Amino acid sequence: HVVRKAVFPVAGMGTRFLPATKAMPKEMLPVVDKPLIQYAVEEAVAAGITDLIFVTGRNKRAIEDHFDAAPELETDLEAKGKHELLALVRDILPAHVNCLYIRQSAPLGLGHAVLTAAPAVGNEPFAVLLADDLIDADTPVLKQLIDVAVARQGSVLGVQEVPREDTRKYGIVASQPVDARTERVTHIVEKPAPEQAPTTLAVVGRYVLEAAIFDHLRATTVGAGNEIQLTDGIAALLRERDVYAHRYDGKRYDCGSKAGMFQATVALGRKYHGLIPE
Amino acid sequence: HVVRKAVFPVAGMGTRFLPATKAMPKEMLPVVDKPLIQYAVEEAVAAGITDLIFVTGRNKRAIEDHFDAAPELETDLEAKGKHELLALVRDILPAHVNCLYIRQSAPLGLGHAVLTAAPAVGNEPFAVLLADDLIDADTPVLKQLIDVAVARQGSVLGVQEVPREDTRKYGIVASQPVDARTERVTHIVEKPAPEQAPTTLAVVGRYVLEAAIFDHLRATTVGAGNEIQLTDGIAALLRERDVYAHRYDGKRYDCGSKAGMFQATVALGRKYHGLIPE
Ligand SMILES: O=c1ccn([C@@H]2O[C@H](COP(=O)(O)OP(=O)(O)O[C@H]3O[C@H](CO)[C@@H](O)[C@H](O)[C@H]3O)[C@@H](O)[C@H]2O)c(=O)[nH]1
């Protein structure tokens, strides 16, 4: 049981961030000085991922141009003695890592986005990271989730308790503990109304999934908001396989919203840059 | 004496904001939900500019794709009934306004960037806006300078007093009053050491300029930081023609650094979005 490939769905419409997202996806929006996606990609590489798979929509070259080499810059910086910046540019992506780009025909849902990656993953377990869920942790959260998958030979979702008023935002897991941080998922519902949400334990955008999910996604139909939900492909996988929920150790920011991106800017400005509101 | 053309230099390397500025200019970095450049362009249109001139570099794609139409997006929105955003998307470039793109061969300086615009400006006075100086004013700051340029038939710089420790950041003007807010300029030096700065009156990135500057720029050689400076071209133009400095009324944030962009996010998030540090 080995995970070396990760999928980054970056093909949503990002309408919550117009006009900022007219020419770039929301996952290219920066927190201080780094795009959301590079945070997630850094986590995945730290977790052992070697093969990055990006599912693009509008402004696809924005992502491609960020992670592909730019020797016009690399040459220019190496000229001006700007050594620190230059290796900072290489630190964006280490040499061994590969990037490959697939196009989503339409933004038909998170689940349809992942199914799009099936030819690239092939038949092996794989990660999924939603970069709008920015997580700051001492140990990479994806490394946390993979360890669980190997031990228990099953899928793993990252999860945290949320307010019951916010369940229209998340897939909500009903589960039974196996250890202090891990539970086995027996039901999962996408964006339940607060009154019917089974629990308050919600899925964050960090997944480790067995290849079996793809067939369950080819059979998946539109659910919440008339979208093909990854959650509903996990719900079909549940009947057949083991799915776990792990309360990872780390701090998540809802950068899919203007308010949580503000808090990410404030918190991480202070932590990694020394920036304090005047 | 009419100013209808404005030049937007967006072709620097933006190294202070790497890695976010690998595939986009710093002027496409957002404050909450609007890129730095769109603030400045909105100001210019309010000030009467009809012709937008963008001087691009390597990362032209982000600037072009932001202000050029995206009927792929316009059509999806027209689908989802989102009337309000659709019009916010068309307003990015209002109906009366046109834009054109000319490219800087290499990031050789701000003055070289402006000289690149000479063919589009032709022979008439024109505005220049540096988008990393984001300004919040009850009356568009460039409109303040245009009125002064018209009145006194001359070039006009926006200026505000700064601490003498920050003189190394800006062009510094030596001048003599003409009225309470306006002075006649007698020298300007780029990034003087504080011990050598003649004054503490600094140039903000808003200019109204006569076409005579262009030949002064063809004759300008590298100065501060091995760059062709617009300031050194203005220092030559001073001797030949009238150059004015106006203490605009408004609140400037130097978003050209991580610190001033953070304080703009904090300040402007609170005022205009209700965003308050947790
Ligand atoms: O057609 C689509 C839809 C989405 N995305 C991407 O998929 C991710 C998720 O999209 P978003 O609209 O942010 O989904 P949410 O409403 O945030 O919901 C998802 O993510 C939550 C965690 O943030 C989970 O709780 C939910 O179960 C899950 O559906 C983002 O990276 C999008 O860019 C695509 O690429 N294509």
Ligand SMILES: O=c1ccn([C@@H]2O[C@H](COP(=O)(O)OP(=O)(O)O[C@H]3O[C@H](CO)[C@@H](O)[C@H](O)[C@H]3O)[C@@H](O)[C@H]2O)c(=O)[nH]1
């Ligand atoms: O080769 C280049 C270099 C810069 N730029 C653009 O020019 C502007 C200025 O570049 P920056 O490095 O930000 O210059 P500063 O050191 O901020 O200095 C300028 O801006 C200050 C106010 O912000 C003034 O006080 C200074 O005199 C003036 O030179 C930015 O919008 C860049 O995009 C280009 O288009 N091409």
Ligand SMILES: [Mg+2]
């Ligand atoms: Mg989301």
Ligand SMILES: [Mg+2]
């Ligand atoms: Mg600047």
